[PDB]
Design a protein around this nucleic acid. Structure first.
Ligand SMILES: [Zn+2]
Lengths: 48, 162, 49
DNA sequence: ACCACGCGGGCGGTAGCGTGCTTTTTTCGATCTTCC
DNA sequence: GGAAGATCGAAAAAAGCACGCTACCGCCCGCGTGGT
RNA sequence: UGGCGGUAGCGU
């Protein structure tokens, strides 16, 4: 849940990002890239 | 004696890595596809690299060492399975060189006949129907509202794809 | 404000304010448990997040 | 010239970065040693 | 009578390293872009 | 008024 990984304001127009949010963003980006390349009929090496 | 390898490059540095590798006399290959459509608009239609952040390199390891290629500017790292770098079979390169590019449009955001949602605009939070992309950054959509459905023109920034 | 289908999306986890829709059409306890149709976020207390 | 964001990921390099503990657990070259 | 189970030490990976409290510093993506 | 890292200190 987002409350367990809060985005605490920094009182300067910036947001402090927890490590969990960054890791989840990495996983989401990698999964989206894999889906996009699978839909592109990529060669076996690239898919692997 | 020459061998084919796959390299994962940096972000937006494919051209720089290709130029540096060509300066070192190493054969380079990267698929091309005439398809480019993002929020920026202003006739984005231009060629873009297929399979981003991937580059095939043909060279002989005994002439140019793998460490030198790994240290080339723009190239991030070798696509390696296990300790040794992976070797791309020549059949894959041959089949990817010629008929790999396809006219099928993967990003469906500019394509019409779809269902989108609007992030901000005159009628926020109302789903819209993409039917005809007149010009660029000009999107006429059948916005649905309680009072009346309106064929309204909004920007690509206003509505979010799906 | 949260995006749609993001890591903080209100539709998935809940509204950002207690008994207040993200859109703002319903901002009272009378509409508790009613999912707003414009933005698809349920009107509930923030603790459900 | 600044202001704002948007996809990615170790870094900068045409290589190499480390460099003063103890105890427990796992695996394996290599014997070994006992014998199927 | 040359192989299979025992093992044996040697190497490699993993986990832990007392608690409270106080003050300061620095930092809270990051660089490569796109319109103006 | 939220944390992380570093430094120094207090009490054992
Ligand atoms: Zn609403």
């Amino acid at each position: 849940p987002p409350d367990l990984r809060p985005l605490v304001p920094l009182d300067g127009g910036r947001f402090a990002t927890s490590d969990l949010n960054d890791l989840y963003r990495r996983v989401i980006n990698r999964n989206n890239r894999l889906k996009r390349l699978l839909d592109l009929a990529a060669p076996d090496i690239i898919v692997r | 004696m020459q061998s084919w390898y796959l390299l994962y490059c940096k972000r937006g540095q494919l051209q720089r890595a290709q130029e540096h590798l060509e300066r070192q006399a190493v054969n380079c290959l990267a698929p091309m596809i005439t398809l480019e459509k993002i929020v920026r608009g202003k006739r984005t239609a231009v060629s873009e690299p297929l399979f981003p952040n991937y580059l095939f390199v043909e060279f002989d390891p005994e002439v140019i060492h793998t460490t030198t290629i790994n240290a080339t500017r723009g190239v991030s790292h070798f696509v390696r399975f296990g300790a040794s770098p992976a070797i791309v079979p020549s059949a894959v390169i041959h089949q990817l060189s010629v008929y790999k590019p396809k006219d099928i449009v993967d990003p469906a955001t500019p394509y019409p006949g779809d269902k989108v949602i609007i992030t901000e605009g005159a009628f926020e939070g109302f789903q819209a129907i993409f039917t005809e992309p007149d010009g660029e950054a000009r999107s006429m959509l059948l916005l649905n509202l309680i009072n009346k459905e309106i064929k309204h023109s909004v920007k690509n920034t206003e509505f979010r794809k799906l | 404000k949260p995006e749609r289908d993001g890591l903080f999306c209100a539709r998935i986890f809940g509204p950002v304010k207690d008994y207040e829709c993200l859109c703002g059409k319903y901002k009272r306890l009378k509409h508790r448990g009613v999912i707003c149709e414009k933005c698809g976020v349920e009107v509930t207390q923030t603790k459900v997040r």
